[PDB]
């Protein structure tokens, strides 16, 4: 089973490149994952100078699998049961009256770690909207991401409202869509609709220089 190769605290590395409105950028991140608990603690770096978009924005693009499924659960975990050879993960993120970004992400064990690697393209983003303009807050809510099967692609669908706090007092919704399809040929699971509730957290290292963001994470997966 892939779930065996989360019973432990599990190391993990992000690679993002990305492009929006023509800025390219790029995030490195690394950190661990206790799927056991549900908890993730990471640290992101902007690599290519000051990030072009806010970093809440990148928080659902920048590992599932570390999703703590309970007991009455195990059935319902798609993403451990993938593991090792990982699942393609895609996604289009609309930021309501603003741009829109798609991304196709790998999530698989490159040797010891959990790998995340991602292309992320972004496009008709307003130039003094919330994101291009940087005028959302440096926190995140709680979300609930309801999960389907799809049994036709071998994988899971999701669709779920993500809602940043813009720094006047708004929200800027970002309305997101998303498939998982396996990468390998092994038989999968396949889940009956549940959800997955998250908790997230954002700090700075009072040591890093760099544009950066340090994340910590809750999220659990709960049925009917």
């Known amino acids: 089973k892939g779930e065996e190769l989360f019973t432990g605290v599990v190391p993990i590395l992000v690679e993002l490149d990305g492009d929006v409105n023509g800025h ?12 056991t608990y549900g908890k993730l603690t990471l640290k992101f770096i902007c690599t290519t100078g000051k ?4 970093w809440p924005t990148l928080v659902t693009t920048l590992v599932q699998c570390f999703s703590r499924y309970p007991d009455h659960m195990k059935r319902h975990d798609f993403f451990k049961s993938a593991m090792p050879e990982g699942y393609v993960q895609e996604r289009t993120i609309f930021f309501k009256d603003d741009g829109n ?3 196709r992400a790998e999530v698989k064990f490159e040797g010891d770690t959990l790998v995340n690697r991602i292309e992320l393209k972004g496009i008709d983003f307003k130039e003094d909207g919330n994101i291009l303009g940087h005028k959302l807050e440096y926190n995140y809510n709680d979300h609930q991401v309801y999960i389907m099967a799809d049994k036709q692609k071998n994988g899971i669908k999701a669709n ?19 498939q998982n399809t ?14 997955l509730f998250t908790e997230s957290t954002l700090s700075k290292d009072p040591n890093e220089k760099r ?3 340090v994340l910590l994470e809750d999220v659990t997966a709960a049925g009917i």
């Open 182 to 195: 396996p990468i390998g040929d092994g038989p999968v699971l396949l889940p009956d609709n549940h959800y």
């Open 24 to 35: 390219k950028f790029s995030v490195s991140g690394e950190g661990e994952g206790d799927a």
């Open 51 to 54: 990030l072009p978009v806010p």
């Open 101 to 103: 970004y798609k991304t």
């Open 211 to 213: 544009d950066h963001m």
């Open 160 to 178: 779920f409202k993500i809602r940043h706090n813009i720094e006047d007092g708004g929200v800027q919704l970002a309305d997101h869509y998303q």
